[PDB]
Design a protein around this ligand. Structure first.
Ligand SMILES: CC(=O)N[C@@H]1[C@@H](O)[C@H](O[C@@H]2O[C@H](CO)[C@H](O)[C@H](O[C@]3(C(=O)O)C[C@H](O)[C@@H](NC(C)=O)[C@H]([C@H](O)[C@H](O)CO)O3)[C@H]2O)[C@@H](CO)O[C@H]1O
Ligand SMILES: CC(=O)N[C@H]1[C@H]([C@H](O)[C@H](O)CO)O[C@@](O[C@@H]2[C@@H](O)[C@H](O)O[C@H](CO)[C@@H]2O)(C(=O)O)C[C@@H]1O
Ligand SMILES: CC(=O)N[C@H]1[C@H]([C@H](O)[C@H](O)CO)O[C@@](O[C@@H]2[C@@H](O)[C@H](O)O[C@H](CO)[C@@H]2O)(C(=O)O)C[C@@H]1O
Ligand SMILES: *[C@@H]1O[C@H](CO)[C@@H](O)[C@H](O)[C@H]1NC(C)=O
Ligand SMILES: *[C@@H]1O[C@H](CO)[C@@H](O)[C@H](O)[C@H]1NC(C)=O
Ligand SMILES: *[C@@H]1O[C@H](CO)[C@@H](O)[C@H](O)[C@H]1NC(C)=O
Ligand SMILES: *[C@@H]1O[C@H](CO)[C@@H](O)[C@H](O)[C@H]1NC(C)=O
Ligand SMILES: [Ca+2]
Lengths: 320, 172, 172, 320, 172, 321
């Protein structure tokens, strides 16, 4: 007999499952994903003055390995490092290597300044090696000089070289120490005297003695040249005191501004833009979380140990 | 649920209501009708849009790499980084889980409250001219044509117009 | 509290009700009785069990040592580790305190709502045959024997059976 | 004279206090703890192929200190280190000691491989000391050999020994350098010549020179034997070039797989299982948080600065 | 809002009510009057004071320097510290934002519930002697002088005293 | 007409905006700030036995540079380092310098213990320099002695000095190596003999040789005195064997307990109190968060990337038309 008005709410045939504080299997009308599972298999470089180093390793830019001849100076906001890139043509390594690599990979450019180092007539400063080929001929790291006695067997003279930082910004200076494979080789290059290299400034102090001894050939060579580095502040002097074994800098480096360092094998794409990168490529999602990798760079969604996390965008679904 | 309407005294949702989240069905002498309620529907949608605007977001903090992809790093430092990164990931995984669980509970209960508030608004409009059946409907004790039904939906129903007729029918 | 029933218009709980969380007491010619409501009780317990399943958990992340118990590590990295671990502990301590405070607020209010939802169900069942006491009781304006009281508890009370005479008793 | 039906809730005599967002002292019908504050003062090792090192320090396993004679090789998934464990019998220390200890404590076993190093007739390779007692008397580190001149005062001969890794996994090589108590002692053992020990692989190089400056006695001995170590990759060689002062390896080590390192003072219990350990024992709780210690290893509840945090499991308690 | 009263069926607040958060305005033959409700006001204030006591605090963990202000740090270790500190700050910023958003939501809805609970208390006290107008008022169907109005505000109104005359006026 | 009773809630003319889970622009009757934006540009030291080092660098306290003469010993709960503080009067530097500074800035005091080192007739232990002025005269590091030959030209004798730690706590011992500016200068102070300094304890050993040669003049001096340090354990001894070039300790140091190290340029204020400090001053707030600096020490509000976060302390403000 009475007329009737009924209050109700919508429903859908295919609801979605979400988790609440009290229920792991709560069916709602709609929901949306908060964890990103996909990435673009490319480095999205639109809006970035980027440098793809190819097979040049960042440290190779400072010392001047032949692979890095086109990357000795420049400017950039993004620096891309690739797998198996070359830093050391001659067998060896850098002391405090990762600190240096990260420093270069957050710069926005490199400039080179001459040390102005000259050497006496009893020093051959043009030592080369078959490990570092340039134009089909034996060469050496472009920013350094392999110093040896000009006459074979003769005592390398006590030498002093001082670089003044005349610039208003700090300069990064590198040098190497040669480690002969035998007593004969050491005597031929530097003489029979005890070898000592000291490097000193107001902000740095260290001593190096060439290691002489038999060891396995690396690319047919038992010798080693290990690299060392430090910063020279504006107005400060850094002095090298050496009598054999020093691989001396002919230029120093100036790191300019800021940039984002990316390590990835993914190909470049100038069409797309991104702010988040990882080994496998670019993450352009708007979502707050991601499950692709705990190792990302830039402005990124936070990594989580979750396949999916659904946020309800509707009421409980209560079908007919 | 918290407010007792959705998955509560309202038995189920309407799949055939495709133009709104909440609404009305009626029956009177002339026939039947259906209409969505815009205000309650929009109240629910706007609150959910608010959550999405807050949640679908990343920080603008620029992070650098502290782990080399292509070379070995120091073993002691690597262990510290691994401890720290895994600790940070446990925190974010936990925060993510809690955020979405908490928000999902609130979204569901908010939607329930909007259903109840519409129901309550209609109850107070009808005053002594109608009675609740317990299923989310009101049995109206007077002739209520399509214009009258529209006035209930659009919050312009004047109870005093029908009160004399309605009280006589209720007492019988 | 939020829903106004527990520690609200219901003055106190019943220690004698040991077979449920919510329920009924009654009075009629045949005497008095008590009975728990299974459905409301189980709704509250199931929701609390859901929280426990969520919360009573640790992560499956494997952590290894970055601090030596029985020897000294490098002082610089040790200070970084101490700063990091203490920062992580402040976060988890904060998260733990917030989690439990928020969940406890919700548990208490959820339980309050389940009481009100039972109360509201009974109100709508009784329709015009009873009036609210103000302290969680309904004064029923007709003779309601044990089978009638049972019909209210098990949700099969038909108001139309007693309506005619109930209304006359109310108007007097 | 109206009949009535009354709605109500349960209550309990013994209510319990919890904290909410708005109330510190909220009485509820029931609650449960979320922070574990009790521990088992025992290392729960059921289901674990474990090794308790006792008084043997992990480094002593590699060099073969007498305290470690029962732990020269092994396999394990869990390695337990104890307080005041012995690494060295003769006075001295390992360079890069902590990194070595941690690396051993990350392993799932140690195997030993003979170097096969041989020496000319003018070398005594069976040098021993009162500091390293084994069985009857004066002995030495089991995995090393103290090389001295057979004839007291005679120049130790220039010797070369090379170890090739013939395995498919990396080997950990250790050696020592003896630093004599005086010039006279140095002359007695190795002769009057300048001493020089050079070590070299593809990836490692170093020079060592015995030092003779006056220093105090440690258990009656002013001499020192310091240890050095490196990893030799599959197929690579490590060459020792020396003329007195080298404590040479007789065997090298291979760290097998991975395992969980525990530093604890608690005794072993093979009746109980656990995935979380600390200095004072094991944490077997189901609870998410823990107030025992910030230093734990394994799969653990998170450390919090709180004795107790009670989670309500019931409604407000409102008695009569 | 969640409980439908504040910014709901109560059209607006009263700027002139300066001695309470919730209260009453009446109209009878003697005129008008206003009065704050102490108990509901204090219930809301105490809950907000509760939140302030929990939120307005810092940890007692003593942190020491891991970054020198007046000297350089190793670039690798400096980068680890920077990553860790920035990761910690992103967590605390997120946590702070979530805390205050969640608390603000609850504070507003708690205040709404206390308004509704006062309304519900008055509704049940008045019983069959008054009717709701839908705007937060009760039309009382008997002469209710200043002492009668006081008894409603003070929770001592006896519905049975006025029932006979009230029902006649409601039925007309 | 029925009499009426109406239920309502308060409102204010000037509501405040807060953010909720669902709304960025929610007007409420009242709110309060949770993020502190203001700092006192002053180091609040009330209730602290503090030491302000001023122009004295922490390492200068141990070697006894003239600028540190009032900071050679003492006790403190808070140690304050300033910018451009002086550690070295003579040209040179300390090996493992930052670790030493950090160690001192973690301490709650310093005691000094005599080495008891003595020297024969041929050693002049009172070497001084114009680089280290004290009371208008040439002086030296207060806790060290510059040993030279008494007769200019003569060989500095082979010498042994042994310090025994007779205390129950570890002692920090420092020494210097003089690196002469020329071969001529080396011969005048220590003689024509080749120089060697050995240092040996139970837990430490090292060898040092005076490197001789011309280098840039720091305040008209090409010579350098570089410093080294180690810890001597309770009951252990440390022996210096030397024949020229050693700058020997006359006292060793004992770092006492723990204290809070602060690096800041802000002036001291003993009127205000605080438990949180940074480069720019003190953070005295009761609030849980702060946006002044991520670089803080003590018991501090947590740094957040936010200008303001308003916590509601009232209902929705719904004003009258
Ligand atoms: C010289 C003098 O009057 N007094 C002490 C002198 O006691 C001490 O010499 C050492 O004394 C201890 C006493 O237990 C041992 O006898 C040392 O001898 C051994 C050793 O057991 O360690 C003998 C062993 O055969 C030697 N082994 C080899 C391979 O040569 C070693 C070895 O030469 C040394 O350990 C190398 O440092 O020594 C005995 O040397 C010294 C302590 O420095 O101090 C004198 O002043
Ligand atoms: C500056 C100089 O002496 N350059 C030499 C170089 C070095 O003497 C040597 O690398 C130091 O360790 O040696 C070069 O010659 C090599 C031989 O030493 C080696 O035995 O065989 C090599 C061929 O596989 C090679 O000929 C070199 O590295 O190229 C010659 C160079 O001028
Ligand atoms: C202990 C001692 O010999 N002190 C000398 C001191 C040293 O000989 C010198 O610093 C070692 O490098 O030298 C003093 O005199 C200086 C001259 O040696 C220097 O050539 O010129 C300086 C002026 O710029 C200065 O005169 C010194 O440093 O005061 C004299 C002191 O007794
Ligand atoms: C850190 O974790 C990575 C990935 O899980 C692993 O490969 C690496 O060995 C770990 N680093 C150290 C030093 O154990
Ligand atoms: C780290 O904390 C522990 C425990 O408070 C303390 O003993 C130790 O000195 C701290 N580490 C360093 C390197 O200061
Ligand atoms: C109290 O709570 C605990 C934890 O959920 C539960 O095991 C126990 O049965 C509860 N007690 C009662 C009487 O319900
Ligand atoms: C760490 O961050 C600070 C502040 O932005 C910056 O000055 C410093 O260069 C950073 N350190 C490194 C090693 O990049
Ligand atoms: Ca950086």
């Amino acid at each position: 007999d009475p007329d009737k008005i009924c209050l109700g709410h919508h429903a859908v045939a295919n609801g979605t499952i979400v988790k609440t504080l009290t229920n792991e299997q709560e069916e709602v009308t709609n929901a949306t994903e908060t964890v990103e599972s996909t990435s673009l298999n490319r480095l999205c470089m639109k809006g970035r003055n980027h440098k793809d180093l190819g097979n040049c390793h960042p440290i190779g830019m400072l010392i001047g390995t032949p692979a890095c001849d086109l990357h000795l100076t420049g400017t950039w906001d993004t620096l891309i490092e690739r797998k198996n890139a070359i830093a050391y043509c001659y067998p060896g390594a850098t002391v405090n290597e990762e600190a240096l690599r990260q420093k270069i990979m957050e710069s926005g450019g490199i400039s080179k300044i001459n040390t102005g180092f000259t050497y006496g007539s009893s020093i051959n400063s043009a030592g080369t090696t078959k490990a570092c080929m340039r134009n089909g001929g034996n060469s050496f790291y472009a920013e350094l000089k392999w110093l040896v006695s000009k006459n074979k067997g003769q005592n390398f003279p006590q030498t002093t070289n001082t670089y003044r930082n005349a610039d208003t910004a700090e300069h990064l200076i590198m040098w190497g120490i040669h480690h002969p494979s035998s007593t004969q080789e050491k005597n031929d290059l530097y003489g029979t005297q005890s070898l000592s290299i000291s490097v000193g400034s107001s902000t740095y102090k260290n001593n190096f003695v060439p290691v002489v001894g038999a060891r396995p050939q690396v690319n047919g060579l038992s010798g080693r040249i290990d690299f060392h580095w430090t910063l020279v502040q504006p107005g400060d002097k850094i002095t090298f005191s050496h009598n054999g074994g020093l691989i001396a800098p002919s230029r120093v480096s100036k790191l300019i501004g800021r940039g984002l360092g990316i390590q990835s094998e993914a190909p470049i794409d100038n069409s797309c833009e991104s702010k988040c990168f990882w080994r496998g490529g670019s993450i352009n999602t708007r979502l707050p979380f991601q499950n692709l990798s705990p190792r990302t760079v830039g402005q990124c969604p936070k990594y989580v140990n979750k396949k999916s996390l659904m946020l309800a965008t509707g009421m409980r679904n209560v079908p007919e | 649920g918290l407010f007792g309407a959705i998955a509560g005294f309202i038995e189920n949702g309407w799949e055939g209501m495709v133009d709104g989240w909440y609404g009305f069905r009626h029956q009177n002498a002339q026939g039947t009708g259906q209409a969505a309620d815009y205000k309650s529907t929009q109240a629910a949608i706007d609150q959910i849009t608010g959550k999405l605007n807050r949640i679908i977001k990343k920080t603008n903090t620029e992070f650098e790499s502290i782990e080399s992809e292509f070379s070995e790093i120091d073993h002691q430092i690597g262990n510290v980084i691994n401890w720290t990164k895994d600790s940070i990931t446990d925190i974010w995984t936990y925060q993510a889980e809690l955020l979405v669980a908490m928000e999902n509970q609130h979204t569901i209960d908010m939607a329930d409250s909007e259903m109840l508030n519409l129901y309550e608004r209609v109850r107070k409009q009808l005053r002594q001219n109608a009675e609740e059946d317990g299923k989310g409907c009101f049995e109206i004790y007077h002739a209520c044509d399509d214009s009258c039904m529209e006035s209930i939906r659009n919050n312009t129903y004047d109870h005093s117009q029908y009160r004399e007729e309605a009280l006589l029918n209720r007492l019988n």
